[PDB]
Symmetry: D3
Subunit: 274 residues, 6 copies
C-alpha cells in the first residue's frame, strides 16, 4: 500500500550536507549512484534562490566525486499538505542562477537521469529536458510548460533543446499551448525514455544507473560529449576536445613531449596513423 518511490534502506546521507534545507542528497549503499532531490513538496518543489544555491552545491559535489558515476535527479513527496506529487514546479513565485544549474548538468562528465515523480512545470520542466535521460511515474508524472502563461520563457535548453528530442512541431505545441501531458504521452513524443510504476520509479532509475555504471566510464564520457557536440557548437567542441586531450596526456607520445621540455623531443617511435 506504500506508494513512495523512495527506498529508505537503499540510501545513505552524504557527509558535510546536514545543513541542507531545500534539497536532499544521498549516496547509494552499494552503487556508484547518488540521489539529488527537491525538498519543498509543500510548494510543489518550487525552487527559490536558496534552493538553486543548494542544488548547484550538491550537483557540483557529485560531479567531483570520483566514485560516483550516475546522478538521479528527482523531487521528494508527497506534499504533507494535500498529498500532491511533484518533481519540481519551477520558480518560487512568492532564480536565473538555474541557468548555471542547466550548464552544470549539461557539462558534467556523468549521466544525469531525471526521475519525474509528479508535476514538472516551468523551470522544473526545463530541468527535466536538459537531463541526459528521463524516467517518469505512470500515475503521477505531469509535464506542463507554463512559462508563457506567466510571461516568462526559457529560450535555451528548455525550449530549443526540447525540439532536439520531440521534433520542432511537438516542442512548439508544448510551449505555445502549455497543455498538461502524461508520462506515456511524453514517451511517445520522445522526451521521456521510459514509463515506470510510481512505486518502482527509483528502483528503475537504479537499474538504469547500474547498466550505465557497468560500462567503460571513459567511453561513457566521450559519448555524452559527442551527443552534446551536435548542438553545443564551440562549447561542445571545447568539452569533447578537452576529453580527447586527457586521453592524449596518457600516451607515450605525450610523455616524450613533457620529458623533452624538462632537450629535443624524439617522435621516431610514434607513427603517422591514418
Amino acid at each position: 500500500l506504500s506508494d513512495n518511490p523512495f527506498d529508505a534502506k537503499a540510501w545513505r546521507l552524504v557527509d558535510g550536507f546536514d545543513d541542507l534545507t531545500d534539497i536532499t542528497y544521498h549516496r547509494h549503499v552499494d552503487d556508484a549512484t547518488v540521489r539529488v532531490a527537491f525538498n519543498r513538496p509543500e510548494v510543489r518543489n518550487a525552487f527559490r534562490p536558496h534552493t538553486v544555491d543548494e542544488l548547484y552545491r550538491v550537483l557540483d559535489h557529485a560531479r567531483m566525486s570520483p566514485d560516483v558515476g550516475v546522478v538521479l535527479l528527482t523531487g521528494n513527496g508527497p506534499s504533507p499538505k494535500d498529498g500532491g506529487w511533484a518533481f519540481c514546479s519551477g520558480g518560487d513565485q512568492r532564480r536565473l542562477h538555474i541557468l548555471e544549474v542547466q550548464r552544470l548538468i549539461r557539462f558534467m562528465p556523468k549521466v544525469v537521469i531525471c526521475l519525474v515523480n509528479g508535476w514538472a512545470a516551468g523551470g522544473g520542466h526545463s530541468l527535466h529536458v536538459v537531463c541526459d535521460l528521463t524516467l517518469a511515474s505512470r500515475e503521477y508524472a505531469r509535464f506542463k510548460q507554463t512559462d508563457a502563461d506567466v510571461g516568462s520563457f526559457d529560450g535555451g535548453y528548455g525550449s530549443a533543446y526540447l525540439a532536439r528530442q520531440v521534433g520542432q512541431k511537438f516542442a512548439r505545441e508544448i510551449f505555445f499551448l502549455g497543455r498538461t501531458y502524461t508520462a506515456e504521452q511524453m514517451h511517445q513524443m520522445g522526451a521521456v525514455n521510459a514509463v515506470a510504476e510510481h512505486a518502482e520509479l527509483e528502483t528503475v532509475g537504479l537499474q538504469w544507473a547500474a547498466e550505465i555504471n557497468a560500462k567503460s566510464p571513459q567511453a561513457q564520457r566521450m559519448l555524452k560529449f559527442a551527443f552534446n557536440l551536435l548542438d553545443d557548437g564551440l562549447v561542445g567542441q571545447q568539452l569533447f576536445a578537452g576529453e580527447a586531450t586527457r586521453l592524449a596526456y596518457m600516451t607515450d607520445e605525450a610523455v616524450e613531449g613533457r620529458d623533452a621540455f624538462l632537450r629535443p623531443p624524439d617522435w621516431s617511435p610514434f607513427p603517422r596513423y591514418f
Copy 2:
C-alpha cells in the same frame, strides 16, 4: 460535414477583391483564417494565388489584434467532391515560407485534404499542424516531377520526423494519412474532419491566452536552433525591443 463554420467568421475589410484566397477574422477571437480558394483545381496555386497569399499573410502579420493564423484549404471540390488543402503548383512560394517562418505569431496549418508538393512544404514550415483524420493526405510529389524543395520543405521536415522518416517521405513520395504523420512527428494532432477548424480555433485560443511577448520570443527561440544568423537577427531583434522598453535604454 464541412470544417468551415460560416457563422464564426467575418470577411476582412479591404480584401473584397481576392479570387484565389479567402480571408476571415474570427467574430470574437484574435484569430484569422487564410485559405486556398481554388477547390476546383485541388487548391493548386498559380502565380496570382501566391501574390494573394503573401498579401493576406503579410496583412495578418501586421495586425496587432491578431495572434494566430489558421492556414487551410476551402472545399470540397464542386467538380468531384474531393478535399484538398493545397496540391502544389498549378511572389514566389519561397517568399511565403519565409513570411510564415519570420512572422512573430503562430501559424497553424489545418490539413483538410490533399497536401502535395509545394502544398506539403507549406504545411511543413508552419509552426503547428492539425489534420483531418478522414481526408488529410500527405504526399511529396517533388521528385516525381523532377522538382525539389531543398529548404524548409525537406530539411526542416527532418527537424520534425527525423532523418530516416524525412528521407523516406521524399525519396519514395508515398501518400500518408493524418495519423501516420502524427506518429512520425510532422502532425501535432488528428481531428475528425467536421471539427478540424473547431479544434484549430481551440488551439488558437489557448495560444492567444498567453503573454504575446513570451510567445514571440519562444517562436524565434525555436527558429534560432536552425536558422543560423537570420534566426539570431530575429531573436536579437526582439531582445532589442525588450531593451528599448527599459529605464536604462531611456537614459541613453
Copy 3:
C-alpha cells in the same frame, strides 16, 4: 525462410575473388545487393572485410546504371542458424571511410537489418539513408561502451537526428537490445517487414526511388545531408548544383 531470392540476383563481373562480402546486381532492376559474407562469426568485419566493402560500395557508386544499394548480411549462421546483419569489429579506422562513402554517394543506400546489428554494424545501419528491418530477427544493440570503444560521429550523434537526443543517449548509455518495432517507433527504422520478405520489400522501395527523377533524388539527399554536414555538406550540394549549371548557358 531466407530473405535472399537467388533467382533474382546475378553476380557482378570483376568480383569473383570476394571472400568477406557478396555483391549482386538485380536481374532487371537498377539495384545492387551488398552483403556481409561471414555468418559464421555473426558477420563481424575484419580489416579485409572493410577493404572489400569499400571496393564494392565504391564500384556501385560509380556504376551509372545503379540507383540504389541494398546493404545487408547473409545467413543464417551455419554454426547455429542465428541471423546477423553485422556484429561490428572482429574482437579476434577504415570503417569510418565506408561511412563517408555511404554518406556522400549520390545514391540512396538502404540498410536491410536481417539480424543482429551491433557495435559498428549498428553504426553502419544508422548512417544509411533508409533502414528496413526483420520483424523476427533484427536485433539492435549498441555495445561500444561495453568494450570501452565508441563511435562519436555518425554512429551516435547522427542517431540523435533520427530518434532524438533522449532515445539516442539511452541506446548508447545502456547498450540494451531493441527489436525492429521498437526502433521503428523510435524513428531509426523506416519499416518492419517479415523476415522472408525483407529483401522483397527492399526491392519494392528501391523501385519507387529508382522511378523518380534521379537528379532530384541526388539534390534531395545532399539537401538532407547539408542540414548536419556543415561545409562538407555544402560542398556536396553545391557540387550537384554546379552539375545542373553545366547543362545550360
Copy 4:
C-alpha cells in the same frame, strides 16, 4: 568635390514622391543608386525613411535589368557641409526587414560610405555584400551601446565574420571612430577611394560584377550566405538550384 555625377544618373519612374531617399538608374549601366536624402540630419533615418528605403530596394530587387545596387548617402549637409552616409535611427523594427532584403536579394549590394556611418547606418554597411569608402570623409562608429541599444544580428555578429571576433568586439564595446583605411585593414571595407571618385569606383566595380554570368553571381552570393544563415541560407541557395533544374529535363 561631390561623388555624385548628375549627368550619369536618371530618376526612376514611379518614385517622384520620394522625400527621404533618392533612386537613380545609370544612363547606360545595369546599376541603380539608392541614397539617404536627409543630409540635414546627417542622413539619420526615421520610420518613413525605412519605408522608402524598403520600397526602393524591393523595386530594385525585382527589376530584371538591374544587376547591382549602390547604396549611399547624399550630401554635404546644407547646414555645415559635413558628410554622412547614414547616422542611424532618428533620436528625435522595420530596418531589420531592410537588412534581410539586402541579405536575400539575388543581386550584389555595394555600400558606398561617403561619410559618417554610425549606429544602424554602420549596421547597414556591415550587411551589404561589398563596401567601398571615402578616404577623406568616411567615419565608422558603432554608437549603439552609448544609447543603450544594440544590433545583435547582422550589425554585430556578421561584422565578426568580416574582421574577426577580437576586432568586432572592440568596435562595439568601445564605440570608437575609425577611418576608411583602418576598416579596410581590419577587413570590413573592400577598398578606400578618393571622396570625389567614390561613386565612379562604385560603377567600375558594378560593371565587373555585371559582366560575369549572372546565374553564377546569384549562386555564389547565396553560397557565401549559406555559411552563416543556416536553414534560411539553405532555402535561398536550394531555391536557386531549383531554378537551375527548371531549364532541363
Copy 5:
C-alpha cells in the same frame, strides 16, 4: 627608467583575498575595473593546479561583483631571476581545470581584456585567445603556441576560436609551426586589438576599460552574448536568451503574468508587436 606596467598608486587589494599565493587581485581606486594577474614570474607565470583554483576563485568573484564592469587579465613581472617578462607560459610542467576558467571568461557577462605583458605560450596563449579583447606590450609580448611541441593540444577555444579571429590559414600556421610572434604581428593577423608601449600597457587597458564602462551595461552584456552566439551554438543561445529573459522579467507584461498566478492573466494592454 621604471618600465613596469603596474601603477602601484592606482590599485587597491580586494578584501578576503590576502591568502592568495599564485595570483594577485586588485580593484581600481576609482574605476569599476579589476586587475587579475598571474603571480609566479619566477617560472614564466606557468599555472599549476593550485594556480587555476585561485584564478577561478578570483574571476568568479569579479563576475559576481555588481560594481565591477571590466576585468583586466595579465601577468606580473619581471622574473626576479632573469628579468624575463611573461603573461603566462601555460601549464606548469614540473591543469585541465583551465578549461573551466575558459568557460568562466567566455560566459561572464562582463568584458575580459587580456594584457599580454610578456610571453604567452601554450595554455597561456589560449587564455589570451578566449578573452574578449587583447592588448599587448610592443617590446615584450611574445606569442607562441607550443602545444604540439610537447604532445599536447587545445582543441577548443585555444585553436578553433583563434581561427575566428585570424582566419583558418593563420590559425593553422600558429599551431602547426608553433613559431614565436610579436605584438605587432598578432595585431596584423587579428588576434591582438592594439599594441601598447610596455610601460603604458595597463594604462591603456584602463582607458579601454573606461570607454567600455561608460556604455550601457545592459547593451554591453547583450552584445557579448550576441558575439558568442555566432559560434557557441545552443550554449550561446542559452546565455543570450537568458539575458533576454531577464529583460522580459522587467516589463509590465511579465508583472501581470506573475500577479495573475499569485486569477486569469489579462494581456489586453499588451500589443502584438511586429
Copy 6:
C-alpha cells in the same frame, strides 16, 4: 631561377607511369612534393590529371613516414616561359578537395604562378599556402565562365579573408598578388620565387618536428569548426584511436 631543387628530391617508387603529375619524396625529410606537370598548358587539369592527383595524394596520405605534402606546379612553360601553379580545368576535383581536407596531415600549397578557377580553389582548401612574391597570381575566373565552386572554393575562402574580401574575390574575379592575398589572410607567407620550395621545406620540417598525434588532432579541431558532423566524425575518429590505446579500452 627555378623553385625546384632537383638534388633535394627522389622520385617515388611505383609512379614511373605518371604523365600529368610529378611525385617526389625529399631525400632526408618526411615530406613529399606533388606537382602539376603540364606547364605547357598553364598546368590546367584534364580528367586524367585529376585521377593522377587523387592517386598520388591518396598514396601520400597512407605513407606513415610522410608528415607533410607540398602541393605545387612545375615550370616554367616551355612555350612562353610563364609560371602556373594551376589554372583550373582543361575522379572529380571535389573529391581531391575532400582528400586534402580529410587527410591526417598538413598540406601546404606552394603557389609558384597562376592559380585560377579550380586551381585557385585547390589553394584555398589546403591547410597552409606559401606564394611566390614575383609570380603568384590569384584569380577566381569561375563567374567569368558561368561556373562556381560553392563549397571549399568560396565559402571556405571566407573563413580565411572574411566575408567582404571573399565576396570581392569571387564577384569581381580580379587578379591579386601574393602580398595582397597575404594581407587579406589567404596566404600564410610570401617568398622570393627561387626560394619558394626551400621555404616550404623549412615549414614542413618545423611541422614534422612536432608530435604527429597532436598535429592530427589539431587539424581536425580546425576542420570541426566548419565541417559539422563530418568534422565531428573525423575528430571523434581520432579520439577513438587514442581510446583504443588505453588500459581501459584493453580491459574491455
